[PDB]
Amino acid sequence: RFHSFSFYELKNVTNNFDERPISVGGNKMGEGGVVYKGYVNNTTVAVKKLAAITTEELKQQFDQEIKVMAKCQHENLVELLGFSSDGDDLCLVYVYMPNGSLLDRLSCLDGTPPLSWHMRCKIAQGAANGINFLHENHHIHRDIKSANILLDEAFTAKISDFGLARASTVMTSRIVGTTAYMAPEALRGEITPKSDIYSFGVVLLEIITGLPAVDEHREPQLLLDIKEEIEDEEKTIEDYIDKKMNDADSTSVEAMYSVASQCLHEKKNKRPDIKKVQQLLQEMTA
Numbered sequence: 001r002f003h004s005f006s007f008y009e010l011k012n013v014t015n016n017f018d019e020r021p022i023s024v025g026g027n028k029m030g031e032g033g034v035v036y037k038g039y040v041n042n043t044t045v046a047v048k049k050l051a052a053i054t055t056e057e058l059k060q061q062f063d064q065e066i067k068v069m070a071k072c073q074h075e076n077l078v079e080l081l082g083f084s085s086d087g088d089d090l091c092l093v094y095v096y097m098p099n100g101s102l103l104d105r106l107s108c109l110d111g112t113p114p115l116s117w118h119m120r121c122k123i124a125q126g127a128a129n130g131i132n133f134l135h136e137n138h139h140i141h142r143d144i145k146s147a148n149i150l151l152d153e154a155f156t157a158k159i160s161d162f163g164l165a166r167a168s169t170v171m172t173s174r175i176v177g178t179t180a181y182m183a184p185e186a187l188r189g190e191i192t193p194k195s196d197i198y199s200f201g202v203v204l205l206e207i208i209t210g211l212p213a214v215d216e217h218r219e220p221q222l223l224l225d226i227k228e229e230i231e232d233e234e235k236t237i238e239d240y241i242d243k244k245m246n247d248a249d250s251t252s253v254e255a256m257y258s259v260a261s262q263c264l265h266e267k268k269n270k271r272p273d274i275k276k277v278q279q280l281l282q283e284m285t286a
């Protein structure tokens with residue numbers, strides 16, 4: 001179901017993997033592997049070139065992305081078009097997302113305008129629908145974060161990066177993920193869909209506050225610490241509502257915060273399941 005590209009055709013797609021930013025006319029869109037813009041015929045694409053975790057581990061992540069994408073198609077999941085596995089190079093080719101990542105739109109990277117409260121609610125609902133589809137199909141994402149929530153031209157939320165996804169509580173010896181979003185049990189090696197819920201709660205805090213989960217030049221560096229300040233009544237969520245919005249209403253904001261607080265319950269069995277998260281987010285805009 002996916003087109004097998006040769007690494008050489010992807011060179012003709014990405015203008016030989018041009019590393020200048022797309023904001024100045026280049027092909028680079030983001031990094032951490034690097035994602036490049038390209039054209040396949042008249043289709044705009046995103047080409048993720050994977051970079052070194054052992055070679056067999058990176059290869060397992062590449063094969064896992066293909067396996068999950070082959071089985072999961074949904075309007076709130078990114079769509080894989082093809083891949084390249086020839087040689088020591090590994091590429092994944094996706095439909096291009098005109099509004100990039102939720103992380104980048106919350107920070108207004110490259111001068112994009114701040115997202116309205118109304119749009120933020122729709123994005124949170126779309127992301128919850130995508131996670132629900134994955135959990136309904138017995139898949140645990142393991143890397144839910146705002147950098148992995150992409151936005152199409154209509155700002156439809158699309159869950160990405162299925163390289164760490166697992167079929168569905170079990171344990172692992174290789175702890176993987178993004179620490180600022182991870183549930184305490186995920187950090188100690190447990191594999192459970194309840195961890196995706198906790199990470200989604202961190203995304204909801206990023207949506208409310210416009211603050212990234214981690215910022216090295218911020219005090220406190222972790223957004224979960226800010227949550228601790230609100231739990232210990234040292235501050236309120238009103239003190240942290242993103243000032244870059246003009247349409248946030250306290251009722252709707254408090255309702256999303258209450259969803260986020262439930263997602264962030266200390267004990268995993270007290271967290272709501274994804275169907276309940278969807279219900280609560282739908283009630284918030286009802």
Ligand SMILES: CC(C)Nc1cc(Nc2ncncc2F)ncc1C(=O)NC[C@@H](F)C(C)(C)O
Nearest residue numbers: 029030035046078094096097098099100101160
């Ligand atoms: C790498 C991330 C941060 N960015 C993208 C990712 C992308 N698609 C995917 N990238 C990686 N995995 C799956 C995909 F669908 N399409 C596109 C982008 C991307 O930058 N679009 C442009 C917008 F962000 C703009 C024009 C506001 O700058």
